[PDB]
Amino acid sequence: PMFIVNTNVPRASVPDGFLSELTQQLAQATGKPPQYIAVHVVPDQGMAFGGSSEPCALCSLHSIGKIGGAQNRSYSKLLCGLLAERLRISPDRVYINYYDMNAANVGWNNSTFA
Amino acid sequence: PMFIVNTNVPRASVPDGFLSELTQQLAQATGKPPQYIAVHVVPDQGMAFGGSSEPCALCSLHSIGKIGGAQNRSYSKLLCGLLAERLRISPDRVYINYYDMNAANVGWNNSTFA
Amino acid sequence: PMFIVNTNVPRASVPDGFLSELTQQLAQATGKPPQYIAVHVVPDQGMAFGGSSEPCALCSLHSIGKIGGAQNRSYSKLLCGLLAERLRISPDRVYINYYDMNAANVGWNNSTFA
């Protein structure tokens, strides 16, 4: 699985530890070994939400399965919680797009997961 | 709706007010309320289009509904128009990927739009 | 087709010519003229793979068709090979998401490809 965060919060406000924290919390939440979890956080971005440049985040979670109605509500609670606590972003200024990827459509190690 | 623009145009050449103009014109085009529109502009990117480093852009528009054949033609004319006028990028060096997101696959405010 | 690479490899470790090499190699791989290929390389990223900040990449390939089981295995071998050779990233530290776009969902030059 892969989780990408894009945010207008400054780099200095992103805690050391945050990438590892997301890795651990996603590994637990998705049920997948942490070895497969990739995380990417992009601060200092030129973005607006609702026409305002108050702290916000645009995120994506891609997984091969483990994506669906209730699972996504649960990931949204977990991930908005982490963003509010660690980056001080209001949950109502966060979007997370969820992508259920086909195994044949994810490349890794010179091949795919199919 | 969420609209992201990645470009090799330098940050000094993105005018004041561009994020606000995009938010407004996206609200005019999709008819969704401005309060829910997110916009993100990433300049100074290492990009080529057709093997050339002349000004170009790669963009994405995600929306829950309001995506389709004639709608996306209308969005493309609006958005290439804004990129040409404001960032001086030729329309034929712009790609925009359109994504019709399932409400259940969009997280916000600790939950989803389901 | 559009190929995007995000990596923690530093800018100075990205060799001259890389965007043209990726344009040429993807044009031959997808059997399309290079005038259609857009490439985007983003170094210096705050990212981890499996909880480690060793060199890694998160990439996307979007195309109108030419996306499938065998085709995606072939693109992964080519692209992991280029990232290992040029950026010194281990193939088992690369994810590539593949997207078969419908023509109606790709904007270009004030309209779509539909």
Domain containing A1 — which CATH number? 3.30.429.10
Which residues of C participate in the annotated binding site for substrate? Answer: 32, 64, 97
Asked whether the beta carbons of A39 and A19 are under 8 A apart, the reply is: yes
A1 is an active site residue: yes
For B:57-96, CB contacts with A below 8 A are 62
Which of B9, B76, B89, B90 should we substitute to test contact with C (largest number of C Cβ atoms within 10 Å)? B76
Residue A66 assigned as binding residue? no
Q: Which of C6, A45, A109, A49 is nearest to B43 (CA)?
A: A45
Dist CA C110 CA B92 (whole Å): 8
Output the CA angle A46-A52-A53, nearest 5 degrees.
35
Longest dimension (CA), chain C: 43
**From the centroid of its chain, how far is CA C61?**
5
Helix (H) or strand (E) holding A7: strand A2-7
Residue B63, min C-alpha distance to chain C (Å): 12
Domain count, chain A: 1
Residue B109, min C-alpha distance to chain C (Å): 25
Is some CB atom of chain A closer than 8 A to the CB atom of B15?
Answer: no
Residue B33 carries which DSSP code? -
Is some CB atom of chain B closer than 8 A to the CB atom of A29?
Answer: no
Q: Which residues are within 8 A (CB) of B7 and not within 5 positions of it... i.e. 6 or more apart? A: B41, B42, B43, B45, B47, B55, B56, B57, B58, B83, B87, B89
Give the SS3 label for residue B87. helix
* Cβ–Cβ gap C95/A101 under 8 Å: no
Please name the member of C23, C41, C107 whose beta carbon is closest to the beta carbon of B51: C23
Domain of residue C70: give its range: 1-114
Q: How many CA atoms lie within 13 A of C48 on its CB side?
A: 17
Q: Encoding tokens for residue A7?
A: 């945010």
